[PDB]
Amino acid sequence: GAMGSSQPRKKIFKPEELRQALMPTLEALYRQDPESLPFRQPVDPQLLGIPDYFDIVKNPMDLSTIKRKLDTGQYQEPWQYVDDVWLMFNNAWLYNRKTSRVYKFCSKLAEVFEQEIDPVMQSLGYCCGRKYEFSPQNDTLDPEPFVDCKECGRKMHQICVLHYDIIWPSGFVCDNCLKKTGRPRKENKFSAKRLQTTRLGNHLEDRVNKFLRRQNHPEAGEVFVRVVASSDKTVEVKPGMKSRFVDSGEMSESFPYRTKALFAFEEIDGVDVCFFGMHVQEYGSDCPPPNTRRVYISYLDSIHFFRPRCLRTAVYHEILIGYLEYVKKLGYVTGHIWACPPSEGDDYIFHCHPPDQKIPKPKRLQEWYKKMLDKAFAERIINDYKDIFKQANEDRLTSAKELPYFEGDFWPNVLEESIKESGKLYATMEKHKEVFFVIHLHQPPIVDPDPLLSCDLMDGRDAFLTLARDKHWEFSSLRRSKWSTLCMLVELHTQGQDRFVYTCNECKHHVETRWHCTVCEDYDLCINCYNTKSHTHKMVKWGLGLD
């Protein structure tokens, strides 16, 4: 029953201060006519004919009761007023049908309150005056989390202030109490910029930023593109196709590929926001037919908060066109896209999309890729592109073993169904002609210069979806996506599986204490090499060995 605490520099509010600040908002509700009228007195179920009411609404609340408390002085902190206005709204929204008068009255009162209470609560030193709950995820909704300033005691929305103890382990200090300090907040070192770079990531981001510079739009921020996971996998031929082609030795039992997960982030309001993500499968020059030198885009997802909107599509295209150009240069021959719009509520990569992010009609989605590919053809990056059906006929395919066979793809499961219902494949291909693109990119072996990044969280799409569902990292709004990115990036920086050995770029020996180049992407010399091999750039001394 007993809980002790200390809080000397606490913000404490005197009644009159609140009223002078708060009640101009409670009055803006009373001024709503006729909408405020059912809310000026406690709901009387015996006047209205609804004995129902007190069984459904457990804590009645209304304007008059709130006006009393604001005059009684019963509100010590400003959140208690705000909690009571939202309690009023939540009662009405609950009991009444979304079509009734009162429910629509309520949404008008609430829209007014949102506009009034935000600037006021911010003048009192808070983030906003909203009540937030996370999307459904029964009956219950989970409440957003709060942080208290270790100085003020002012309760804040953790998502509003974007505070996380891992980044700032000495705790949350509100922006004003930091002004009573001179020193600003410490830098967030768990940023997108600071994710390990790759030639693949760099080529894509170098291409997006070069485009954004020519655009010179003032709302735009820097784009960071990062490969965050890669590994070597195999796809096993399924049992039907196995007995039909593997036992004879016409198809290999499994096909090797390298999978990669990559994300793009944009600077928006000075923080990292993840707006684009993609998993790919890459079948090299030692992969047997039919997968030799082929890349396939398994899953592609996006969140529409990129700034500005009028550049969103062009930047998605720049990443995709950049991916084709990159693997074309390394030696891949064909690319494949499965252009399928999500089945409402299926999140491809990011948990919980914005309610008003458009799910495109399949004709629009395919036109979208067509425009991207047409753009690539124009720049002479693509040699040509056709749908799977027109392409199969043009190559005179007659056997199922000539269809590329990719992990998790549509066609391996169509082939299993065909074999199981045998006792028309060209018909199924024409039927879904529009959904499957075949991209012609064009030799010595393919050698990927990037190393593998072990990151279980991004080894395929399920691990990150699950973690975001459990942690309520939604991408449903700009403010929630900012928070989700923040924590996503903390997970990549600190919970990955790679540990780093350092070698001298000259004699290749393992180093502890070392000279690290300030200019080159990643260049080191042991003490001995620093003492013999000249390097023209300034170098700094890093590490500290125990011998």
Give the interface with Zn ion as residue ranges (CB under 5 A): 127-128, 149, 151-152, 157, 160, 174, 177, 504, 506-507, 517, 519-520, 523, 526, 529, 537
CB-wise, 381 or 504, nearer to Zn ion?
Answer: 504
DSSP, res 218: T
Q: Are 144 and 159 in contact (CB under 8 A)?
A: yes
Tokens of 299: 């899953």
Q: How far is the CB of 25 from Zn ion (least distance, A)?
A: 16
Centroid of chain to Cα 371? 25
Centroid of chain to Cα 57? 37
DSSP, res 484: H
| Cis geometry, peptide bond prior to residue 78 (ω within 30 degrees of 0) | no
Q: How far is the CB of 179 from Zn ion (least distance, A)?
A: 9
Strands 436-440 and 334-338: antiparallel
Q: Where are the alpha helices (DSSP H) in 219-268?
A: 239-241
CB-wise, 128 or 381, nearer to Zn ion?
Answer: 128
Q: How far is the CB of 116 from Zn ion (least distance, A)?
A: 15
Q: How far is the CB of 547 from Zn ion (least distance, A)?
A: 16
Residues 459, 228: Cα–Cα separation, whole Å: 9
Q: How far is the CB of 118 from Zn ion (least distance, A)?
A: 9
CB-wise, 175 or 374, nearer to Zn ion?
Answer: 175
DSSP string, 440-483: E---PPP---SPP---GGGSSSHHHHHHHHHHT---SSHHHHHH
Residues 140, 94: Cα–Cα separation, whole Å: 12
CB-wise, 117 or 229, nearer to Zn ion?
Answer: 117
Q: Which residue has the tokens 């049908």?
A: 97
Q: How far is the CB of 135 from Zn ion (least distance, A)?
A: 17
Measured on CA atoms in the order 10, 11, 13, 14, is the torsion positive or negative?
positive
Strand partners, 226: 263
Tokens of 237: 């031929």
CB-wise, 83 or 506, nearer to Zn ion?
Answer: 506
CB-wise, 127 or 264, nearer to Zn ion?
Answer: 127
CB-wise, 378 or 507, nearer to Zn ion?
Answer: 507
Q: How far is the CB of 176 from Zn ion (least distance, A)?
A: 5
